[PDB]
């Protein structure tokens, strides 16, 4: 009857931690030193929908993005999403959250022209 | 010049930094059930003692089900959250996204239909 936990060793810290990189509701792009994508999880893969992993960030940003006039808070994509970026510093690099905000952004028009 | 991916503690440092900014809660148990660790945002949606904790006691003090939850479940401060619960090598882990605000803009916009 053996007893486990992801706090266990390093090992398995990470093999948890990629998990939650793996299934969570939102985009994470991890850049190097040189702003290269060395990793992206399936979220962040999935809205950008370009490829990601090698490419440099500022590449990136001339493709899978597409601003327009009333993004205010957000970005928009070439499909047309409205996402959120949450940009940090890394020891190694750089952490960028995407989160999509496009079905909040509707319903909040909704609502604005719902008023009238 | 430097990357996450240059060493296992390296990596390990990087993922521990997207969890601790993640817009999202994650609870992590280990195979008894109990809460081996909990990010900040899960921390602050639950605001209930955590790391430690059997996760099924935390339910009976974190959550307060409505009969109109659907497919979120309430938290005793009014929240609404919605679980999504995974199975670990290791334990399990859960991951709270809010939906207070959704479910809010939603009903807002019921009652305005109804008019």
């Not at 750089?94 to 909704?110: A, F, K, N, V, Y």
């Amino acid at each position: 009857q053996e007893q486990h936990s992801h706090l266990d060793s390093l090992e398995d810290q990470v093999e948890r931690y990629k998990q939650v990189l793996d299934v969570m509701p939102a985009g994470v792009i991890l850049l190097d030193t040189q702003g290269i994508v060395r990793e992206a999880n399936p979220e962040a893969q999935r809205l950008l929908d370009v490829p990601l992993v090698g490419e440099k960030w500022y590449s990136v940003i001339q493709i899978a993005f597409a601003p327009r006039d009333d993004d205010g808070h957000e970005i928009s994509l070439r499909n047309g999403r409205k996402v959120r970026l949450a940009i940090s510093a890394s020891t190694t690099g750089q952490l960028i959250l995407i989160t999509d905000l496009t079905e909040t952004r509707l319903l909040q028009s909704r609502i604005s022209d719902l008023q009238r």
